[PDB]
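Researcher: Can you fold this with chloride ion in place?
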Amino acid sequence: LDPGLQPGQFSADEAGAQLFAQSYQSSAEQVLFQSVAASWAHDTNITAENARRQEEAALLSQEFAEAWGQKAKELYEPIWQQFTDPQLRRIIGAVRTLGSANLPLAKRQQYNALLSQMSRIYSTAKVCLPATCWSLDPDLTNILASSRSYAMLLFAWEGWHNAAGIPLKPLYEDFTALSNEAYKQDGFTDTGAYWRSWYNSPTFEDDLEHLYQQLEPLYLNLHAFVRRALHRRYGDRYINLRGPIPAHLLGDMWAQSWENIYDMVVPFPDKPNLDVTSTMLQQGWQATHMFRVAEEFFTSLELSPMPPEFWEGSMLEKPADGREVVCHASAWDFYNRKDFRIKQCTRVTMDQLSTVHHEMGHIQYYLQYKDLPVSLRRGANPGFHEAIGDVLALSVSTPEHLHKIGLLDRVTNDTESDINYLLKMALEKIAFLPFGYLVDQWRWGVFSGRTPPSRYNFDWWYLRTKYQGICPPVTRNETHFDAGAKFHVPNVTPYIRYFVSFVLQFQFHEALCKEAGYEGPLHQCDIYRSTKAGAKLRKVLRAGSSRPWQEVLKDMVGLDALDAQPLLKYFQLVTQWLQEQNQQNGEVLGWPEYQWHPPLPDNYPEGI
Ligand SMILES: *[C@@H]1O[C@H](CO[C@@H]2O[C@@H](C)[C@@H](O)[C@@H](O)[C@@H]2O)[C@@H](O[C@@H]2O[C@H](CO)[C@@H](O)[C@H](O)[C@H]2NC(C)=O)[C@H](O)[C@H]1NC(C)=O
Ligand SMILES: *[C@@H]1O[C@H](CO)[C@@H](O[C@@H]2O[C@H](CO)[C@@H](O)[C@H](O)[C@H]2NC(C)=O)[C@H](O)[C@H]1NC(C)=O
Ligand SMILES: O=C(N[C@H]1CCS[C@H]2CCC[C@@H](C(=O)O)N2C1=O)[C@@H](S)Cc1ccccc1
Ligand SMILES: *[C@@H]1O[C@H](CO[C@@H]2O[C@@H](C)[C@@H](O)[C@@H](O)[C@@H]2O)[C@@H](O)[C@H](O)[C@H]1NC(C)=O
Ligand SMILES: [Cl-]
Ligand SMILES: [Zn+2]
């Protein structure tokens, strides 16, 4: 480690620790930037060499965290928890958490390299036929979204899960062991316990379970209503009205949101098509237009536009030069207060417009807290970060707003168009809730040892059936590693943040709509051009992680905890309607035939 990055001598008291923190975060900006820069070069251009360079940067980051962590324990380990400055206590507590810098050098290299190889496998895996080959994005994504051929959907689902998951499993086992070894030396029972510590809530898991209990009836009724529609399309042979739904039939490779089968379950197909994708294509929208439209929503709230460095440096379309890239959408802070970027293989669809807003919400956060010391350049918690752009997307998706931006002819404020809209939104938001909850239940069990390699897939499908009420459409065994076929697992991105975000965003929406002076139904609110709403949001974003998220949340919504009531209030009308439809059709809520799996299509896979 270069001498200019190594820690100096400071007095072992709070005054000295304030200077210590200043010195730490001036040198951390330089180290963070070289790490982020090298990850960018790899993720937009996957090669062996860019992997080598990203690993050299990670090693340097670990030398740096080691030097400053040790010094902080040396100087302040007995005293810092009694510092009177609460922001300083946060910074010091973070610095003395070394994570993978606790590993000896050779295990640092093995850990850094497992990450590179798992990333490569996920983002370069292909599904080949009997002879070109399909990538996840756009090819398999488009098939899962738009094909209504059971056998084609099956070939894509099985092909993807086999191609990504199987080769990842031995690597994922090795990564898990090294991660745990590292964080045990910070005092955590396992890596999962460290991830959970970010929410600074002793009742976190209980609080999440309580939340899910209030939401599950909504999901169960949505599930039964959709299962009935799939039964009509595919037949009693492939759909069991009292069993789990085959996992390839819900419009999405992971069955995690169902908006792509809206056209199949829309009760009132005579009414205007609330999926404006066709109009977007008709009108010639491109990725740049989508990002500019999102930007203008932010500036309408008097938040910040995207800076020149964003437009010059971001990757907004999949490269056509054949380069391999990580296509999964992501947002990047280079910790130099100047460079901020999105990397997204943008497609022209309505759901991609929502994802553009999701990613730009991250950038806005970065811009609002870029002048905090680096340790506070974080969401109040990770769920806050994932929620920001989704909140704006809630306003954008209203038929009123879509009409304002030229994507929909005005609809009638009647009950039936209301039901169409809330149902489309339920397919996007309610259907996700079980998946957002279960992914880290699986991963926490892996980190804790409750789920050894011998049960990776057994416990994954236990949770997928328990929570989502789906089943694999072909037999699986422990050679398969179906959790590995979901980006965040090999790319080691925690997931409970998305469950938190999907609850939180309705708490935020309700607060911002009240602040805008809106007084109609919550699900028709559009906060566009509300400078009052923008001001309330700006307060959150500029706080970073300098204050406890419970306090930041109370300032914003009036309450110091996650709360399902705003989401329930948003969906109330369709919650009731779905309950009624299910009763009239005599549905069974849930999936009591929990063992059921569909048969294979005749002659599969030969007829394609
Ligand atoms: C749309 O109409 C609502 C009124 O609800 C209607 O009632 C049903 C019987 C059926 O007609 C639904 O399709 C309708 O939505 C308006 O909401 C009211 O706004 C006032 C304003 O002061 C407010 O005080 C009331 O509480 C609101 N009532 C309800 C039931 O929420 C709403 O503003 C209209 N919005 C648009 C965009 O047309
Ligand atoms: C993708 O990354 C590779 C490095 O792995 C880049 O290849 C280098 O390209 C520069 C061009 O300025 C040459 O000077 C080097 O000799 C190349 N090195 C190797 C090993 O090929 C490549 O340019 C990158 N591609 C893009 C589109 O940025
Ligand atoms: O979050 C992300 N990207 C989005 C894009 C699609 S929308 C969104 C909401 C639903 C849940 C989740 C889903 O798709 O699985 N999700 C995403 O992953 C990125 S910022 C996460 C990331 C962080 C660091 C490095 C790399 C990636
Ligand atoms: C695991 O599964 C592998 C492939 O799946 C198999 O093929 C389908 C068509 C069905 O026959 C299904 O029952 C099978 O699982 C097998 O190659 C492998 O032997 C299976 N067992 C193990 C231990 O890997
Ligand atoms: Cl998280
Ligand atoms: Zn995100």
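Model: Folded with chloride ion in place. Residues 1-586 form one domain.
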